[PDB]
Ligand binder design. Sequence first.
Ligand code: SF4
Ligand code: SF4
Lengths: 101, 371, 158, 163, 163
Amino acid sequence: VIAMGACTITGGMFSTDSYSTVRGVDKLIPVDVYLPGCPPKPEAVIDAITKLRKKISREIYEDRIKSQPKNRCFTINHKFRVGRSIHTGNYDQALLYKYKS
Amino acid sequence: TTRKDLMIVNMGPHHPSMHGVLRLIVTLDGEDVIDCEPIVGYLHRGMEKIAENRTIIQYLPYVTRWDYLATMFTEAITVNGPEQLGNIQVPKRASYIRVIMLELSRIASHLLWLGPFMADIGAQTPFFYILRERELIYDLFEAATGMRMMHNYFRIGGVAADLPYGWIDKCLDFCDYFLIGLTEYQKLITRNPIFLERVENVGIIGGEEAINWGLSGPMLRASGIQWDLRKVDHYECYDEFDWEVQWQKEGDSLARYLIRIGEMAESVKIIQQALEGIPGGPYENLEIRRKKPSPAFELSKQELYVRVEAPKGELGIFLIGDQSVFPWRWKIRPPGFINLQILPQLVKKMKLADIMTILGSIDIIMGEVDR
Amino acid sequence: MQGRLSAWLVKHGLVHRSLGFDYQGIETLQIKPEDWHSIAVILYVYGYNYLRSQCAYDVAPGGLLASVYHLTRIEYGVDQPEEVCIKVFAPRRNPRIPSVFWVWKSADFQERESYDMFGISYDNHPRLKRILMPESWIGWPLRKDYIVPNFYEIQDAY
Amino acid sequence: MVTGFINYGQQTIRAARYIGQSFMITLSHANRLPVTIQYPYEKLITSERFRGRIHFEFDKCIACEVCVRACPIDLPVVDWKLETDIRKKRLLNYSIDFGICIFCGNCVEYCPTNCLSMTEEYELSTYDRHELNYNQIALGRLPISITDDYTIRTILNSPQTKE
Amino acid sequence: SWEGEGENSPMEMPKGPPSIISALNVEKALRGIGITDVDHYARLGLRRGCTYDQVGAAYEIQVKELSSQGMDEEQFNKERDLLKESYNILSSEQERRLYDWSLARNSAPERYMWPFEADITQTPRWGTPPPQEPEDVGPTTAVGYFLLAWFVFSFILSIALNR
Ligand code: SF4
Ligand code: SF4
């Protein structure tokens, strides 16, 4: 994973007042190389890829067992309310009969 | 055939044809689109909320993040809302520079529309072909403004800085080269039999439907309507230059493609005319230019609506001030967000492979559809 | 001064209220929500082809919710088109405004945005659901007294 | 009936001609030189006003904090204390985190002492996010110009047009 | 505060032919109820969807030729007013828009028809578009001649080499 852009590292301009922007994908995915810059120059993207290659070439077989998930689980009943999907795919079909004055 | 025969596929945020993160819930009856439901908002950063609690000199970097292909149009609308509210005049040199930059951004936006459109049709080489010249446009912008995209060049009552030495001849040479490049594009693409047979009769839109749906720009102009907000509202200096509003009678995607090519040519003519008759004098307004604490632009207490002819249509700002630095309300009228709502009507009873052609005909980028 | 549209409405006996003009001199009229569905058709009958923008905004926190419509004409041979702003005010406790989707289709997405950001419910809109925010979201973000409920991925990148 | 076959003939030869035209237009680009800039063995010389990594002069800072207010996100951190002997603001720490920085140019434009400058130093990628929190020592380092690296071919975008 | 203006204005349609544009008529059109049983396209001889010159021509030939020839009494005068309604419905753009939309809604009330669909002024009339570049047809004939010569050479070669 390469986090390119300031909005992918820490949220960037939206780190302060956006109510829906995830402040960095390191909260979601493990990032190998962080690439700062708003529209980073394509040469800087190539440099980040070069650093990623520098880290990739250092890998051994032991790193493979660092990569498989541990896969722990815990299951309980929730007694929530189960509801069907709101977006069912029905759109603009028989629309002219949906006036309902 | 109502259910268990109709395949509901989520051609969603991660799809090569989906420009950005647009999602389509498409119901297919053997490669025939029964209907489609557009789901947007995967890029909704709440930019209208961030428009408040931010001064204009702070909000200007945020502006280029809607319509990131045509950034100067968003910057122009953001800087001409409050400068119309405060009755700030713009010098003639700054206005000419603004016209040149807007037309260059229109050229770049039409290019980077043509790329993904032909990619969705199936041709990948035109993407690199447009990028060869969009890099030159980026070089001109970086020489003038300082960055390729997110220029932060437009300012209230003028521009950030004057054009650097040796910019006029560079832009003229770019125009001379780009006319040849556009002729090469029309030679390669326009009469191709596969391109025509993929494009000739898809997405026929009536003029009345285009008016009612709120379409603008090349979408509305490709239905027999000669409606350009540069000539209607007398924006900047567009009344001084000789140019023609590109409109076509038929409603298909080929009309939109021809309109965008002709708009690129007319834009090039506008840069040539503007650079031939560039004026002198100042560029920043000396009246507004005045360790000490520095206030921002205090907006007046009245409502305002300002429009611009973006390459995707009409981009608008509805601004309500509060006699303070932070605006009370900042509503963005996005051309793509309104042009997108006609897509389920067009793709209905069409085929699966035609969805790419229809969606590439509409200039949709997802950073401007949501805010 | 009375606008052209206001003079036409008082000639045709349609109730309204003139709120003045913006900085460009475009007329601003206020329409009661109960009469808005009948007045929109008459507005199109006047000749307002183009629903340029539909917007909603907060008059004051804990106060009225205003829905804004911008209208103009698209016609051949007209030099200066006539544009009008029209505002419909609804209470915060239960905002209800009739939908103009059956007059201008351009409101189709836009009113949904007005429902997604401010919670103004539109009656005759056939597909009124959240468009920008996630479909399972609770709350209207653009209201002035909205408070974000402390999600982990919105907090500071530690 | 024959005219239908004739029209089929003329609307088939046209398609073959235009396919050959597309082939010729595309293959004429094989005689043209490549435009590719071979990074990292070749680097494009940045413009005179390219907005890259910030350079900060510690001696010229007065801790007036207008660079914080001009920032869209109030990013720069200016830790200062008052030197009571002279009652002037003494700077203790200055830090800009480049993971949040967008390089807009507001700080370098609204700084009254002009101690903040934009360099050409792009390519600031790091393996760790928290290594992007540059303090007043990292910001004070002089940028490495690509013209001083003699293992690469510096590419100029356009002729110098200084004649 | 203030008050809601234009509360029927206490005169509104003071004398003359009353306007067909009203809240009640519009509500009836929305619900799918015919707002006027009189066919204003009739009593003029016109067809549905006629243009704005035909309404005036029909007015002229119905008020000067057909009506004035019949009787000279004052019953003609009110009959003139009986025509003067329909023309004023079919000449003004707004009232005609309302009338055609009401007719379209009353015809098929189950399905909805927008006002722009029943309006005849929505058809675009902006002249001719700028023509697209002309086409080059010479290479088409060259390619066709090449393929025809190839086929004839194939025929001759097969016949000669088979023997
Ligand atoms: S504006 Fe300049 S002098 Fe003032 S605190 Fe910021 S860096 Fe220091
Ligand atoms: S360059 Fe812009 S975003 Fe970065 S620290 Fe300076 S003002 Fe803030």
